[PDB]
Amino acid sequence: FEIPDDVPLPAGWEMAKTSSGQRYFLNHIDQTTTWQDPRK
Amino acid sequence: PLPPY
């Protein structure tokens, strides 16, 4: 149902850039990097 | 692919 309007990623998360020109999401909670967010 | 932390 449409997109919410609160926060893209929870705490311990850092949207950053990897590969060459794509924004990833540096997961600090479990040390990892995902292009999409766990909560949309 | 993807940056391995």
Curated annotation (Swiss-Prot), chain A:
Induction: Induced in the hours following cyclic mechanical strain in keratinocytes.
PTMs per UniProt: Phosphorylated by LATS1 and LATS2; leading to cytoplasmic translocation and inactivation. Phosphorylated by ABL1; leading to YAP1 stabilization, enhanced interaction with TP73 and recruitment onto proapoptotic genes; in response to DNA damage.
Cell location: Cytoplasm; Nucleus; Cell junction, Tight junction; Cell membrane
Signal peptide (residue range): none
Tissue: Increased expression seen in some liver and prostate cancers. Isoforms lacking the transactivation domain found in striatal neurons of patients with Huntington disease (at protein level).
Highest taxon listed in the record's lineage: Eukaryota
Boundaries of every WW domain copy: 7-40
Quaternary structure (record): Part of a complex when phosphorylated that contains DSG3, PKP1, YAP1 and YWHAG; the complex is required for localization of DSG3 and YAP1 to the cell membrane in keratinocytes. Binds to the SH3 domain of the YES kinase. Binds to WBP1 and WBP2. Binds, in vitro, through the WW1 domain, to neural isoforms of ENAH that contain the PPSY motif. The phosphorylated form interacts with YWHAB. Interacts (via WW domains) with LATS1 (via PPxY motif 2). Interacts with LATS2. Interacts with TEAD1, TEAD2, TEAD3 and TEAD4. Interacts with TP73. Interacts with RUNX1. Interacts with HCK.
Disease field: Coloboma, ocular, with or without hearing impairment, cleft lip/palate, and/or impaired intellectual development: An autosomal dominant disease characterized by uveal colobomata, microphthalmia, cataract and cleft lip/palate. Considerable variability is observed among patients, uveal colobomata being the most constant feature. Some patients manifest intellectual disability of varying degree and/or sensorineural, mid-frequency hearing loss.
Entry note about domains: The first coiled-coil region mediates most of the interaction with TEAD transcription factors.
Purpose of the protein: Transcriptional regulator with dual roles as a coactivator and corepressor. Critical downstream regulatory target in the Hippo signaling pathway, crucial for organ size control and tumor suppression by restricting proliferation and promoting apoptosis. The Hippo signaling pathway core involves a kinase cascade featuring STK3/MST2 and STK4/MST1, along with its regulatory partner SAV1, which phosphorylates and activates LATS1/2 in complex with their regulatory protein, MOB1. This activation leads to the phosphorylation and inactivation of the YAP1 oncoprotein and WWTR1/TAZ.
Family: Belongs to the YAP1 family.
Name of this protein: Transcriptional coactivator YAP1
Organism: Homo sapiens
Gene symbol of the encoding locus: YAP1
